[PDB]
Amino acid sequence: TRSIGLVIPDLENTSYTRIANYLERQARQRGYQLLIACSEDQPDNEMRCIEHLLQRQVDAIIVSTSLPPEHPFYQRWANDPFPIVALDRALDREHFTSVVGADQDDAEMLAEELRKFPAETVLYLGALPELSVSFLREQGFRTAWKDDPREVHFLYANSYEREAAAQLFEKWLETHPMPQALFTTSFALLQGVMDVTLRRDGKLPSDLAIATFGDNELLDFLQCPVLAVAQRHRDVAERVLEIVLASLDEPRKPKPGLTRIKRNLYRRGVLSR
Amino acid sequence: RTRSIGLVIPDLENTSYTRIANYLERQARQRGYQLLIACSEDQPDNEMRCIEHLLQRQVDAIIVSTSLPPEHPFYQRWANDPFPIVALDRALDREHFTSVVGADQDDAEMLAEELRKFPAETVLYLGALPELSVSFLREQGFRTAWKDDPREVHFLYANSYEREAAAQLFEKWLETHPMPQALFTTSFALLQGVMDVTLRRDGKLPSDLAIATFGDNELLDFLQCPVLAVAQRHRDVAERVLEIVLASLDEPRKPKPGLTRIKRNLYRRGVLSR
Ligand SMILES: COc1cc(O)c(C(=O)c2ccccc2)cc1S(=O)(=O)O
Numbered sequence: 001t002r003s004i005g006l007v008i009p010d011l012e013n014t015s016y017t018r019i020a021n022y023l024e025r026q027a028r029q030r031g032y033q034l035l036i037a038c039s040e041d042q043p044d045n046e047m048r049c050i051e052h053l054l055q056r057q058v059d060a061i062i063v064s065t066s067l068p069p070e071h072p073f074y075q076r077w078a079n080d081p082f083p084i085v086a087l088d089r090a091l092d093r094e095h096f097t098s099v100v101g102a103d104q105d106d107a108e109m110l111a112e113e114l115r116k117f118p119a120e121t122v123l124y125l126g127a128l129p130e131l132s133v134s135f136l137r138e139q140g141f142r143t144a145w146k147d148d149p150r151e152v153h154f155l156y157a158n159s160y161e162r163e164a165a166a167q168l169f170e171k172w173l174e175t176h177p178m179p180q181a182l183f184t185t186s187f188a189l190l191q192g193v194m195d196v197t198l199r200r201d202g203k204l205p206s207d208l209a210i211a212t213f214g215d216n217e218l219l220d221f222l223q224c225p226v227l228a229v230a231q232r233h234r235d236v237a238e239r240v241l242e243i244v245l246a247s248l249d250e251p252r253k254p255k256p257g258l259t260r261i262k263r264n265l266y267r268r269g270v271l272s273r
Numbered sequence: 274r275t276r277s278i279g280l281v282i283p284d285l286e287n288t289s290y291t292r293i294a295n296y297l298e299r300q301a302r303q304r305g306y307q308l309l310i311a312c313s314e315d316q317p318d319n320e321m322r323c324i325e326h327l328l329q330r331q332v333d334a335i336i337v338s339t340s341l342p343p344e345h346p347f348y349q350r351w352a353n354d355p356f357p358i359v360a361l362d363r364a365l366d367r368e369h370f371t372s373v374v375g376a377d378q379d380d381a382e383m384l385a386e387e388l389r390k391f392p393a394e395t396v397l398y399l400g401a402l403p404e405l406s407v408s409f410l411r412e413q414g415f416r417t418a419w420k421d422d423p424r425e426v427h428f429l430y431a432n433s434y435e436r437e438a439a440a441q442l443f444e445k446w447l448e449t450h451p452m453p454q455a456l457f458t459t460s461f462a463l464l465q466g467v468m469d470v471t472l473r474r475d476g477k478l479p480s481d482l483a484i485a486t487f488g489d490n491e492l493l494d495f496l497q498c499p500v501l502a503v504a505q506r507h508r509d510v511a512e513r514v515l516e517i518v519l520a521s522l523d524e525p526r527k528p529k530p531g532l533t534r535i536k537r538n539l540y541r542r543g544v545l546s547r
Contacts, residue, residue, distance in 0.1 A: 218492050
């Protein structure tokens with residue numbers, strides 16, 4: 001049918017949507033169509049989303065899976081010429097080619113740059129440390145702060161939400177002082193922090209080195225140094241499809257496993273002037 | 274029947290269209306239809322090729338935000354055909370096509386009326402391309418409110434709905450004009466441009482500047498000045514677009530052709546959020 005599937009959580013998170021843009025422009029570039037099927041990050045929906053695509057004779061499916069990488073569903077096409085390429089969330093490494101992010105290196109690069117700033121109190125706010133993205137990003141931080149003499153207080157929330165971040169930061173400040181360097185592993189985490197700072201200070205900070213995953217351009221309006229990393233949204237889209245159309249239009253299928261694209265760093269706030 | 278519906282939009286980078294698309298996918302998935310998406314890149318020539326491809330996929334219907342003028346001859350091929358094509362955002366031939374569209378006049382007036390309740394002497398209306406249908410209706414609504422208001426309103430108009438344009442024009446305007454106590458912008462982009470110069474000048478984003486804009490962004494909550502923003506009822510829109518798509522198909526006769534307008538929601542941000 002000359003059509004490719006893309007099962008993502010939703011067309012609302014900016015990361016997935018901007019990739020899906022450069023994937024439309026490059027799908028129609030080669031004559032193929034893109035059929036978006038959202039799971040709302042529900043494994044029940046994703047399983048059915050996939051099933052409805054097979055019924056539409058899609059030639060290939062790119063997927064950011066909500067289920068475990070190794071789980072009975074996807075091991076149905078473990079040994080199948082039917083290609084399933086993973087994005088952002090890896091699948092079984094021995095059976096599927098996944099294009100993922102370089103969270104560890106990315107965290108390290110961001111952390112190295114934050115370390116140069118002359119803070120005393122340095123706070124690391126993350127969430128769900130038991131998870132992969134959470135831990136990979138912690139290692140990256142520690143790598144760059146390994147032999148640094150300053151003590152970094154780590155603080156972990158129950159989810160990557162701003163509501164949670166508000167509470168946990170609001171509590172933290174009772175028994176700790178306002179930090180001078182901040183490393184947040186999500187943009188949503190940083191929002192929570194700012195909410196409380198706005199109520200406490202009456203104004204968003206001007207003497208604080210912020211470092212965060214995820215990037216909005218409105219961070220240029222801050223009057224403090226801001227460091228932020230974002231995906232190479234086009235570059236990500238190139239490789240996911242170049243693996244799809246390798247599996248279709250060549251005898252040798254691509255070798256399974258992971259492949260990583262680094263994030264870009266952006267200087268926002270006062271560092272943009 | 275294939276149980277598929279085409280969707281031709283400018284791009285998937287504009288936040289309006291993407292959020293409309295998100296809900297359209299869900300609404301369609303719930304009803305038992307797949308959604309095929311094709312971006313025109315807002316090029317008229319590309320749009321035509323998209324419609325052709327989508328018809329070879331043999332969809333039951335096509336939604337389109339068209340880059341052609343209403344009445345344009347290309348879309349007279351299906352002027353009077355049972356096959357349904359439902360226009361989104363930008364209207365098609367009102368005679369023989371149903372268009373889900375915003376009430377830019379109604380929204381503008383309502384937003385303007387809210388901006389009148391702040392005690393601001395100088396009131397700057399910044400717009401762009403006044404002669405465009407959209408630009409016009411919004412200015413029309415603004416005057417319907419400030420009809421008998423004794424204060425003077427300065428109407429500044431830019432060459433493009435873009436940030437950089439608004440920045441240059443505003444900073445050349447301040448040269449001879451005092452700093453406004455009230456602002457009305459017809460797009461977030463124009464607002465952005467204003468906020469650059471305010472920052473380059475004052476040193477900080479302001480606190481005593483009543484602001485009313487088209488476009489929305491939750492991050493407007495962080496401002497310490499009053500803010501008023503209008504945005505489409507994306508979900509409500511998405512619902513009503515597909516209702517027509519299906520009524521058109523699942524119901525004898527297509528609904529009354531022409532326009533149905535949907536008012537934006539107003540949100541309160543800055544210090545209005547606390
Ligand atoms: C995010 O809010 C919006 C902001 C807008 O500026 C528009 C426009 O239609 C528009 C009109 C003239 C020039 C440029 C854009 C729509 C929405 S909305 O659909 O998302 O409510």
